């Protein structure tokens, strides 16, 4: 029959500053800055001093509680994201054919280009959303590291790389060729 | 399927519906190319008359055939395309309800051309003595220019009032076919200016089109009259 609801508060770390005006919040740290808009029914996720960020709600129902949990998760991700970063480590796999991967960051619209994917004459490329940065530390041509502050964007970009290479028409077990998420994502750094 | 076993595409398209008489003698282009490149020295369109057809021999290209290389014949339509007078800059603005014209900027000289503007374009062929074009209203380019200043504060994709000077050779007819031609190009302020420079003077085919370039042709078909299903559909 429920609910009605009450406040939850999480302390903001010294490494993070947050600043909020309206429903849109900026979360700022040394890795960089992150903006999202939290807007929802009868919810506030407010900052009580630059000290605590608190979430409170007049109202509750099943729907609200589920939302509050997402809101509480997102924010924890933003805060950790600005200080720690999030990073995905991804590995190129190719059984026959060389996969030629670069990122055209400096000279063009930010995108990751893969060439000769499965012998494909046509280059397959997808953008990078947000300030997240990709470094491919080639070796033979195994390792990709994708690092950024915004958790959403980082996950999307890493995910985008995985979807581009996907071949739905043939069996996956048979054609290993692609890029796969080798990790999730992640620890902090002394650096 | 109740019938036919044994069912075929329907002869004759619904998009070229209605199969009806054109509104005008002269084709009118509904939309034009986009503002990608140089200014209104680049008129979006030009007009001409169909002379007939000829055939030409050319150095081909399509490497895949064995028949590729040497001279090969290709069909041509010849069209006589005289220098055309861009008389004026008409300003159409985008709003909600539709475009309405702010102005037309006139040159000093259309003289027989305005008589041709009077022909069907007004009506009656030397019928009873005039028809009229009002004269340049004691140097009131200022009226035209202040109205030009108005077009620059927004945006049709800047457009021009044009005519074909038909008298040149093949047509016994003298009368000009007035046209609305869009101007496309670079930034808007320079776009008004170039369009402005162009009206002062005639414009050739050399200014508009380069050779070999891809051109869309719009014209109005041969007229049968009234016809049955078999030839039509």
């Amino acid at each position: 029959m429920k609910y009605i609801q009450t406040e939850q508060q999480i302390e903001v770390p010294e490494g993070v500053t947050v600043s909020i005006k309206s429903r849109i919040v900026k979360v700022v740290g040394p890795r960089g800055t992150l903006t999202k808009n939290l807007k929802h029914i009868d919810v506030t996720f407010t900052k009580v001093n630059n000290q605590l960020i608190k979430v409170a709600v007049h109202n509750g129902g099943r729907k609200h509680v589920a939302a509050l949990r997402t809101v509480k998760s997102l924010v924890d991700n933003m805060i950790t994201g600005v200080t720690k970063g999030y990073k995905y480590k991804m590995r190129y796999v190719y059984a026959h054919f060389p996969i030629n991967v670069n990122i055209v960051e400096k000279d063009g619209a930010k995108f990751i280009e893969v060439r000769n994917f499965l012998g494909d004459k046509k280059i397959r490329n997808v953008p990078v959303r947000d300030g997240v940065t990709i470094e491919f530390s080639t070796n033979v041509k195994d390792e990709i590291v994708l690092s950024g502050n915004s958790v959403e964007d980082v996950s999307q970009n890493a995910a985008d790389l995985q979807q581009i290479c996907r071949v739905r028409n043939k069996d996956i077990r048979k054609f290993l060729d692609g890029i796969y998420v080798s990790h999730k994502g992640f620890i902090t750094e002394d650096l | 399927m109740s019938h036919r076993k044994y069912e075929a595409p329907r002869h004759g398209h619904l998009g070229f519906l209605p199969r009806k008489r054109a509104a005008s003698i002269r084709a009118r282009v509904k939309a034009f190319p986009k503002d990608d490149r140089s200014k209104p020295v680049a008129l979006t369109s030009f007009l001409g008359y169909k002379a007939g057809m000829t055939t030409i021999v050319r150095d081909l290209d399509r490497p895949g055939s064995k028949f590729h290389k040497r001279e090969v014949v290709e069909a041509v339509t010849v069209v006589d395309t005289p220098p055309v007078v861009v008389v004026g800059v008409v300003g159409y603005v985008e709003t909600p309800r539709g475009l309405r014209s702010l102005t037309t900027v006139w040159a000093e000289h259309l003289s027989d051309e305005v008589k041709r503007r009077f022909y069907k374009n007004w009506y009656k062929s030397k019928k009873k003595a005039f028809t009229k074009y009002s004269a340049k209203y004691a140097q009131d380019g200022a009226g035209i220019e202040r109205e030009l200043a108005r077009i620059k504060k927004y945006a049709s994709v800047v457009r021009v009032l044009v005519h074909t000077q038909i008298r040149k050779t093949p047509l016994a007819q003298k009368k000009a076919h007035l046209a609305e031609i869009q101007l496309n190009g670079g930034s808007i302020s320079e776009k008004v200016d170039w369009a402005r420079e162009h009206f002062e003077k005639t414009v050739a085919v050399d200014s508009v089109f380069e050779q070999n370039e891809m051109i869309d042709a719009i014209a109005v078909t041969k007229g049968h009259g009234f016809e049955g299903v078999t030839h039509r559909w």
Partner: protein, 199 residues
């Protein structure tokens, strides 16, 4: 506006079906009503289900064979106009005239500087709010249908921009013209006011 000759109505965040009920009834009252800010009206419910209903109506508008009607109306002023025809008795001459008395314009039509007004609790904020299976603006429905819309929002953006400027300077000048009471005043008279009404 609630008189006999005005009549200008604010569409911003109002309920489409609700605006149309009162609008029809006032046209039946014999007013000539100008419904303004057409793109900004909202009709509640998720867009997907709303678009599915309209999509069938578009699919209907694909035929008969013939030409000359039926129709599905692309645009926010047009959607709203369709809404009145259904709301009013479309059979009769009275009903027909009432329909001729509507004009719906998107953004603002040529200057009506005089304020467009909200109707007695017509607005979607309160009228959602438990809540909101989503809520859909007419401008959001019509981007998917096609474009009388594309030019209308383009003008809305320019109208709102121009007007927003005006309103800031207007308000500044008004509080300024106004500081009358920032109290002066008392002057026996204020006692008169308190009494004068009072008794």
């Amino acid at each position: 506006m609630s008189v006999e000759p005005v009549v200008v109505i604010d569409g911003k965040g109002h309920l489409v079906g609700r605006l149309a009920s009162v609008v029809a009834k006032q046209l039946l009252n014999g007013q000539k009503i100008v419904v303004v800010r057409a793109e900004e009206l909202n009709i509640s419910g998720e867009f997907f289900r709303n678009k599915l209903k309209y999509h069938d109506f578009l699919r209907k508008a694909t035929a008969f064979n013939k030409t000359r009607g039926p129709f599905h109306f692309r645009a926010p002023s047009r959607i709203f106009y369709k809404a009145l025809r259904g709301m009013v008795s479309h059979k009769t001459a009275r009903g027909k005239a009432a329909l001729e008395r509507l004009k719906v314009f998107e953004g603002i039509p040529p200057p009506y500087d005089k304020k467009k007004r909200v109707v007695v609790p017509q607005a979607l904020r309160v009228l959602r709010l438990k809540p909101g299976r989503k809520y859909t603006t007419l401008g959001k429905l019509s981007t998917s249908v096609g474009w009388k819309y594309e030019d209308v929002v383009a003008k809305l953006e320019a109208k709102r921009k121009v007007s927003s400027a005006e309103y800031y300077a207007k308000k500044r000048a008004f509080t300024k013209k106004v500081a009358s009471a920032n109290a002066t005043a008392a002057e026996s008279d204020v006692a008169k006011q308190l009494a004068a009404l009072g008794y």
